Design a protein around this ligand. Structure first.
Ligand SMILES: [Mg+2]
Ligand SMILES: [Mg+2]
Ligand SMILES: [Mg+2]
Ligand SMILES: [Mg+2]
Ligand SMILES: [Mg+2]
Ligand SMILES: [Mg+2]
Ligand SMILES: [Mg+2]
Ligand SMILES: [Mg+2]
Ligand SMILES: [Mg+2]
Ligand SMILES: [Mg+2]
Ligand SMILES: [Mg+2]
Ligand SMILES: [Mg+2]
Ligand SMILES: [Mg+2]
Ligand SMILES: [Mg+2]
Ligand SMILES: [Mg+2]
Ligand SMILES: [Mg+2]
Ligand SMILES: [Mg+2]
Ligand SMILES: [Mg+2]
Ligand SMILES: [Mg+2]
Ligand SMILES: [Mg+2]
Ligand SMILES: [Mg+2]
Ligand SMILES: [Mg+2]
Ligand SMILES: [Mg+2]
Ligand SMILES: [Mg+2]
Ligand SMILES: [Mg+2]
Ligand SMILES: [Mg+2]
Ligand SMILES: [Mg+2]
Ligand SMILES: [Mg+2]
Ligand SMILES: [Mg+2]
Ligand SMILES: [Mg+2]
Ligand SMILES: [Mg+2]
Ligand SMILES: [Mg+2]
Ligand SMILES: [Mg+2]
Ligand SMILES: [Mg+2]
Ligand SMILES: [Mg+2]
Ligand SMILES: [Mg+2]
Ligand SMILES: [Mg+2]
Ligand SMILES: [Mg+2]
Ligand SMILES: [Mg+2]
Ligand SMILES: [Mg+2]
Ligand SMILES: [Mg+2]
Ligand SMILES: [Zn+2]
Lengths: 50, 105, 49
RNA sequence: GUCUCCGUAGUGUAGGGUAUCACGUUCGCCUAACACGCGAAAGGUCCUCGGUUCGAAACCGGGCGGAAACACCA
RNA sequence: GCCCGGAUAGCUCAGCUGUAGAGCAUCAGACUUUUAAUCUGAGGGUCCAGGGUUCAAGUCCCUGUUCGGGCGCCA
RNA sequence: CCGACCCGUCUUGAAACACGGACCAAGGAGUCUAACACGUGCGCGAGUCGGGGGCUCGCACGAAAGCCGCCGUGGCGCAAU
RNA sequence: UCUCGCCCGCCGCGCCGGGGAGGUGGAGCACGAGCGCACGUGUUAGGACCCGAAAGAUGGUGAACUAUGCCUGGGCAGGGCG
RNA sequence: CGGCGGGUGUUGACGCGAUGUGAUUUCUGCCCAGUGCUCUGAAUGUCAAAGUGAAGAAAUUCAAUGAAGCGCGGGUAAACGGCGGGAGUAACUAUGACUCUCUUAAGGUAGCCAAAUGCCUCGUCAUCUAAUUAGUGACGCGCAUGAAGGAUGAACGAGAUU
RNA sequence: CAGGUGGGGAGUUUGACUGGGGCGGUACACCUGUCAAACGGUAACGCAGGUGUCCUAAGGCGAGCUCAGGGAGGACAGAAACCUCCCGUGGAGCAGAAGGGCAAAAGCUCGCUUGAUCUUGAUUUUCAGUACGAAUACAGACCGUGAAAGCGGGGCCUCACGAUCCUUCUGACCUUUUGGGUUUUAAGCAGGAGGUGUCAGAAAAGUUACCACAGGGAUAACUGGCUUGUGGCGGCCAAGCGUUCAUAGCGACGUCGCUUUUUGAUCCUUCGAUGUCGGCUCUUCCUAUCAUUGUGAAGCAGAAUUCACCAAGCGUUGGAUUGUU
């Protein structure tokens, strides 16, 4: 007669992700003219722990 | 039990004893437009679930057999219902029993 | 879940810690019931692949 | 104790109108001989009593046993 | 109660509105040291019953009896 | 001197080792409405009833009382099946 | 409402209308007794003689205690093993 | 409650989500009959509304067609769970290696035990004591032990016992 | 919108009687014999049983016969096959349980049949003099049978069964179907059927040791009280045991008691509570005496032992195991 664990996870309150110290969403760069027709050069400035 | 397929009995329309063909009465199909059926369908529509009792406590094992008699008069095809006592096995016009015969060995 | 009471889990309760019902549960089970092996095509040990 | 079931060749079992199967037993074959195998035979108040029935192993009651299941809350 | 499907040599399956076939059971032959294994055949019909449609039926329709499913449930 | 167990209550049975009760004061529990039935009293009586409305210096009492009559519509009764 | 049976009526002659005898069903008739008002008793619906649940429903207030996640702070002698 | 709303998710199978068992070591046997779960629709049976056709003057009735599901067919037990009897038999007796049958979906395997699990029971034998319904070791037809849990094994424990 | 799935969630239910409840059973609706005390009625989870059916004949009528059993005979034929005679008060049969009843019957066999039909009332049984069911006597039709008198509206009698609402069928050239008419449809009136077995008739699974409330000593678990089956302890008779010898010491078959330290039976007190086992501690009491004092008896030589009397003054211990008694 009680809402079970796993059911309580969708409400989010206590079961939200711990995103305080995360470094950002890891993504490719958005596709544009340089991606679509040639290439663009970037430099790897850092390698970090997320 | 065994009853013959014909019997000479009183006909109310003729007013006298006449030959009658004898069949077994079966309950007809429900009309779906009988007033109680209409009331039941209206009651059952919507929410609330089952609104009338459902018996589900059967105790009898037999039914009273009903004989449908039909006067054989061409101008009088009048019908009547006779009920006989409860029986488990009923047949119409079966092989009549004999007395001085050998039982199968 | 077997270590829980029946009020907060389908598998809870009993004088012994046993599931008491098949742990494989259908896909269209309501939430609050589909616990255990959800819509499992098979169970066991995976001997062969 | 209450409730339910069972009783059939020597053994384990099937099954209202002259009781089945397999092993076992006996006899004759085959083999130097035994076993296997082959060909035949015999073997059972169907636990006891009573009743229904033309007819009971069967159907219905009683008794002899045997076998299960309950036998809880203070 | 509704939709059906089924009842057929002893047993089962198959089948034509104008002569019910086959297999499994029984019997006679070979057969194999032999048992198995196999045919040669022979005998064998509930065409599930009753009535009607029929010139003519399992095969068309009602009266029925069982078996199996899926349904249906106001005395 | 004789007689005399503590009341209330449920109970077949209470003085009970059955329950409530330390004491005192004040408060404290079959009421009102509606509908029936029967009995009784009163008026009229095959009738009866104005209750709703209206008319009367609008009002101390009087928000009462009085009256309507082609206001008896209507209710109940006078007829049942 | 049954059973039996024969007559009668007409601006509509009819699947018309009326009548009789004998049983039986009715909370009827058979020269009215009711109506209005008051009172009492009884029954009932209402809080329903008074007090008494465990419950059910609607709408709100709480994480100053505690349970858990997150944010931002603070804190934990002296020795042993090695 | 609701919005293509929200959490996991600033995520992407070395990840999220749902379960069981519970370090290590050694193992984890048989059963898909039952109940679940799942795969396939194959002629396929049943199967509502709607739609289609027919009869009727219409209401209506009938017929044809036929979605999921259910039936039908596979897989799956580290899914839930389950894992038998009766007789005879060895040159003393006693047991029964062995042999017969009935039956199951399979008949409890490796192990372990009067164990926190054994009624009978204070089981029987040994040891511990002067004396032990206690303890330990051993035996095992074990009422009713047993394998994702069985059996062990250091370290540890305000755990139970001698 | 329609079908499926849907304890994820919702609401509810989960009979009664009962020598406490549960398990068991049905004493919950009926029938026979008894209880039952010679009208009728009369209770227990009193005793012995039965019922939810069966029958086109096992219903109706008429006719003709006599049954069970036994004795004596007859080829095969025997204890039982068929035929004959005699006796036969029913010792057979009548569907079933039992009771009653029945002989040119009510039984058996034939022949013809459908009165097991259509109707209205009255009455009896249970009874409240309500219903159902069943039954009795009539009356009105239409019939069957027999020569006829007559008999027959089911079964020789006592049992074999079921309201409202709903459904289904049958009957009236019937009534209504809403402004009128026609026709479908629907409703009605009367009579059957589909069932409620908890049988005067809800539609119904568990669990709670996480539990709750109103109560109950109307009702169990512990004391007490009645009883004493069972337990314990005695007595009477004496067939026997005791190398002989019933009775030193015992006592079979029987039979009479006592006790409330066993366990039952019951449910009178207590459910707005009498703290529920054992041990420890401590006091007192009983005697049906283990020891000690004084005695009697022996199969008492002594020693030891056994039986019995007066007798409860005094004593009746330390430990292993077990919560234990
Ligand atoms: Mg817990
Ligand atoms: Mg749950
Ligand atoms: Mg559980
Ligand atoms: Mg289990
Ligand atoms: Mg009181
Ligand atoms: Mg009392
Ligand atoms: Mg008093
Ligand atoms: Mg007292
Ligand atoms: Mg008290
Ligand atoms: Mg009280
Ligand atoms: Mg007090
Ligand atoms: Mg006071
Ligand atoms: Mg006062
Ligand atoms: Mg006035
Ligand atoms: Mg008027
Ligand atoms: Mg009154
Ligand atoms: Mg009140
Ligand atoms: Mg409620
Ligand atoms: Mg805080
Ligand atoms: Mg884990
Ligand atoms: Mg396993
Ligand atoms: Mg389909
Ligand atoms: Mg497998
Ligand atoms: Mg083993
Ligand atoms: Mg063991
Ligand atoms: Mg132990
Ligand atoms: Mg010790
Ligand atoms: Mg040990
Ligand atoms: Mg060993
Ligand atoms: Mg629920
Ligand atoms: Mg008397
Ligand atoms: Mg009398
Ligand atoms: Mg005669
Ligand atoms: Mg008459
Ligand atoms: Mg009679
Ligand atoms: Mg009753
Ligand atoms: Mg009492
Ligand atoms: Mg002597
Ligand atoms: Mg006290
Ligand atoms: Mg006290
Ligand atoms: Mg003395
Ligand atoms: Zn006629």
């Amino acid at each position: 007669g009680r809402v079970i664990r796993g059911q309580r996870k969708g409400a989010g309150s206590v079961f939200r992700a711990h995103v305080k110290h995360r470094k950002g969403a890891a993504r490719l760069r958005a596709v544009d003219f340089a991606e679509r027709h040639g290439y663009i050069k970037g430099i790897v400035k850092d390698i970090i722990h997320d | 039990v065994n009853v013959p397929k014909t019997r000479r009995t009183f006909c109310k329309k003729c007013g006298k004893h006449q030959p009658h063909k004898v069949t077994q009465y079966k309950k007809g199909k429900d009309s779906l437009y009988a007033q109680g059926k209409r009331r039941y369908d209206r009651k059952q529509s919507g929410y609330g679930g089952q609104t009338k009792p459902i018996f589900r406590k059967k105790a009898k094992t037999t039914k009273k057999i009903v004989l449908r008699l039909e006067c054989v008069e061409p101008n009088c095809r009048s019908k009547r219902m006779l009920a006989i006592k409860r029986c488990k096995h009923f047949e119409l016009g079966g092989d009549k029993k004999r007395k001085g015969q050998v039982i199968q060995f | 879940g077997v270590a829980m009471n029946p009020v907060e889990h389908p598998f809870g309760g009993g004088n012994h810690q046993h599931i008491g019902k098949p742990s494989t549960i259908r896909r269209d089970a309501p939430a609050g019931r589909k616990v255990g092996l959800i819509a499992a095509r098979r169970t066991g040990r995976l001997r062969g692949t």
